[PDB]
C-alpha cells in the first residue's frame, strides 16, 4: 500500500559488473542496517572477471559503495602425491549473498577446481565455493563442500555415483536463525542437484588458508539417486527455510527443482535430515516452477505459507493460443498433521515475456495491519518491458489477487529490475519495513522506503 516511489535511493556499481545480481540487508553488532550487494562480473585486480561484493551503508542519497574485500588469488597445493588447484576466474563471486548475525556469506558458484595426479585428473569443473566474512573483525573463511580428490577414471568405473564435480555450491543460499548455512548446488550428483549444510561457527573454526581440502565434521550433504524423475532437475536452484511440521525444535527446508521430472518442475519441503515431507509438482512443462520460493505467514494464523514462482508459465488465451507471462502459486499451511494441499491462489503475470514470479520477497507487515505482505517481480514486465515489482498485501483469506501497488522500473531497457529483491527490514528506523530491488543489467540497486 505504502512504498514511496518518488523518493528512491540508488546505489551504483561498476559498468558490466552486474552490481545488484544479489543483495541482502546486513545488520552490524551496534544494530546499524547496511546493504550487501553481489556483483558477479566485477573485474579483479588483474583485469580478469572474478566477481565481487559491496557493503553499502544506509544513505538517503545513495551512491558508490566500498568493496568487501576477498582473496581472488588462485591456489595450488602439492600434497599427498596430488596437485590441488583452485580457479577463481569467471567464478561469479556474489552470484548469491546472504547475511546472518555479524557474518556475510558471498558465493562464487562457478569457481572451478581440479586435482592432478601424474597423467590423470579429477577434471577442471565448477564445484563452486562460498566466501565468509565478519566485517567488524576482519575474519575470513571459505566453504567448498563439493571439492574432491577422486580421479576421473574412478567416477567412470562407478557409473558416476556421488559425482560432486559440477555442484556449483552456493548457486542458492539461506541461513537458519540458529546459524546453519544451507547451500543449493543444482549441478550436484551429475546435475540432479544437492544441498550442503554446515554451522557457520564450524565453517570458521575449521578453515585455514592454503589447505583447500578440509573437513567440516558437522556438515551434512543430501543424497544421490537413480530415480530418473530427478535427473537434470537442478534440485537446489533455489532454497529457503521455514516451519512446516509443527515441531518448533526442528527446521524444515524448501528446495526448488525447476526442471524436475522432464522439466515439469517441483518444490520439496524437507526435514533437516533431507527426508521429504512434501512435494509440490509444477503445473506446466518448461514453466520453471521452482525458480523462486518464498516462506512467510500471509494469513495471520502463525503458520508459514509457501510461495513458488514459475516465471515462464504460459497462460491460455483466445483461439487455443498460449502466452508466456509467469505465475506465482500460494500454498497456505493448514492445522494439525495435514500436508500442504492445492494452491489457495494463483497470481498470473500480464505482460508477455514478463517473467512474473522471477523473484518473490517477504516484506513483513508493510502497512502494519496484522498480516504480512509480499513483493513479486516481473523483470521484463510493464507496458514498456522495463520491469516491474508488484506488492500484494496479506489478509485472512490469503493474498489479494489485485496488487496494492505497482513499482515501475526507473532504469532503461535490459536492467532486469526486480531480478533480485529483499524486504522485512527497516533500514531508516521509521518503524516500517522497506524494500531493496536489484537491477543487475543497470549495475544498480534501488531502495524504496515505507511511510505512515
Amino acid at each position: 500500500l505504502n512504498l514511496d516511489p518518488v523518493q528512491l535511493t540508488f546505489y551504483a556499481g561498476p559498468n558490466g559488473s552486474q552490481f545488484g545480481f544479489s543483495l541482502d540487508f546486513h545488520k552490524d553488532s551496534h544494530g546499524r542496517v547496511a546493504i550487501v550487494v553481489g556483483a558477479p562480473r566485477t573485474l579483479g585486480p588483474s583485469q580478469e572477471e572474478t566477481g565481487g561484493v559491496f557493503l553499502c551503508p544506509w544513505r538517503a542519497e545513495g551512491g558508490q559503495c566500498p568493496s568487501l574485500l576477498f582473496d581472488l588469488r588462485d591456489e595450488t597445493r602439492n600434497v599427498g602425491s596430488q596437485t590441488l588447484q583452485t580457479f577463481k576466474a569467471r567464478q561469479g563471486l556474489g552470484a548469491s549473498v546472504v547475511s546472518w548475525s555479524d557474518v556475510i556469506v558471498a558465493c562464487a558458484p562457478w569457481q572451478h577446481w581440479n586435482v592432478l595426479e601424474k597423467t590423470e585428473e579429477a577434471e577442471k569443473t565448477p564445484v563452486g565455493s562460498c566466501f565468509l566474512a565478519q566485517p567488524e573483525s576482519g575474519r575470513r573463511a571459505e566453504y567448498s563442500p563439493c571439492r574432491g580428490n577422486t580421479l576421473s577414471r574412478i567416477y567412470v568405473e562407478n557409473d558416476f555415483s556421488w559425482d560432486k564435480r559440477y555442484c556449483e555450491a552456493g548457486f542458492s543460499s539461506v541461513v537458519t536463525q540458529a546459524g546453519e548455512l544451507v547451500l543449493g548446488a543444482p549441478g550436484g550428483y551429475y546435475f540432479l542437484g544437492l544441498l550442503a549444510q554446515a554451522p557457520v561457527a564450524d565453517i570458521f573454526s575449521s578453515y585455514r588458508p592454503g589447505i583447500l581440502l578440509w573437513h567440516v565434521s558437522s556438515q551434512s550433504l543430501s543424497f544421490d539417486s537413480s530415480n530418473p524423475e530427478y535427473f537434470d532437475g537442478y534440485w537446489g536452484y533455489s532454497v529457503a527455510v521455514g516451519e512446516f511440521d509443527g515441531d518448533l525444535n526442528t527446521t524444515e527446508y524448501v528446495v526448488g527443482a525447476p526442471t524436475w521430472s522432464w522439466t515439469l518442475g517441483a518444490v520439496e519441503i524437507l526435514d533437516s535430515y533431507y527426508q521429504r515431507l512434501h512435494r509440490l509438482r509444477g503445473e506446466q512443462m518448461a514453466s520453471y516452477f521452482g525458480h523462486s520460493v518464498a516462506v512467510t505467514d500471509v494469513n495471520g494464523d502463525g503458520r508459514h505459507d509457501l510461495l513458488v514462482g514459475a516465471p515462464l508459465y504460459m497462460e491460455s488465451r483466445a483461439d487455443r493460443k498460449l502466452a508466456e507471462v509467469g505465475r506465482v502459486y500460494l500454498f497456505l499451511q493448514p492445522r494439525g498433521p495435514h500436508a500442504l494441499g492445492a494452491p489457495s491462489l494463483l497470481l498470473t503475470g500480464t505482460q508477455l515475456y514478463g517473467r512474473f514470479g522471477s523473484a518473490i520477497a517477504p516484506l513483513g507487515d508493510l502497512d502494519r495491519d496484522g498480516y504480512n505482505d509480499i513483493a513479486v517481480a516481473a523483470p521484463y514486465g510493464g507496458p514498456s518491458g522495463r520491469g516491474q515489482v508488484l506488492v500484494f498485501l496479506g489478509q485472512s483469506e490469503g493474498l489479494r489477487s489485485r496488487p496494492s501497488q505497482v513499482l515501475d522500473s526507473p532504469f532503461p531497457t535490459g536492467s532486469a529490475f526486480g531480478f533480485s529483491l529483499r524486504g522485512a527490514v527497516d533500514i531508516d528506523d521509521n518503524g516500517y519495513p522497506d524494500l531493496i530491488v536489484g537491477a543487475y543489467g543497470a549495475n544498480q540497486v534501488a531502495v524504496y522506503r515505507a511511510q505512515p
Partner: antibody
Amino acid sequence: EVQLQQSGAELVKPGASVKLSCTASGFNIKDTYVHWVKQRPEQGLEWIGRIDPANGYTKYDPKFQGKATITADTSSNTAYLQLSSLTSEDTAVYYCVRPLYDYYAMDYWGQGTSVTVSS
Amino acid sequence: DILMTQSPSSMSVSLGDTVSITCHASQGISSNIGWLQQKPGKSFMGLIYYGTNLVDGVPSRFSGSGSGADYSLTISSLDSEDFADYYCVQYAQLPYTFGGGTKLEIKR
C-alpha cells in the same frame, strides 16, 4: 570429543596372522582417511597405509604391500589392520591415525596396540 | 621416498627455556609437515598441521615455522609436561615419512 579406541595387546606366533581394530568414538569412521602407523624403539615410526572408509579405497607403503591389509566397516564404525606371515620384525606398537581438518594431516592418534611375535 | 632428518636427537634443557627442534626434508614439501608429541609411555598428540597451524587445544607456547625443505618447532618457556619425544611427519608425498625424533631431557 574425537577418540580412536584400539584393541588390546596381542601375543601371537610367528607365521600366523593377527587383526587389530580401531573403533571411532565421538565421530563416524567414514568422516576422514584412517591411517595405520608402526612404532619400534630402534627403527622409529613407519607409515603402513591408509583407507577411505567411505569407499574402501586403500594406499600402502611398498614395504608392507602383501603383509598389511587395511579394511573398515562403517556399520561398526571400526577400521582394521591385518598382518599376515608374522615375523619378529612385526613385534611393534601399532597406531590408527586421522586428521583434524586437513584431509592429508595426521593429528588424532589411537592409544596404540602392542603386538609381540614369539614362539 | 622423502627422508625426514630431525635434529637434535636429544637436548638437555631446563624449565622456562625456549628451544627449537628442526627437521630437514630431502626435497621441498611446501609446509606439508606435521609435528607430534609423545610423552613417556603415552601415545601421540598432534601439535601442528600444515607447518604452522596449532591443533585445537594445543597451548600457544608451541609454534611451527619454515619453508621449502627446512622446518622448526619452537617451544617457548618449557613446562614440566614438555619433557617428551617430538617427531615431524611429511605428507607432501606418499608414503608419509617420519623424522627420527627429538627427546627433551632435564639438564642437571
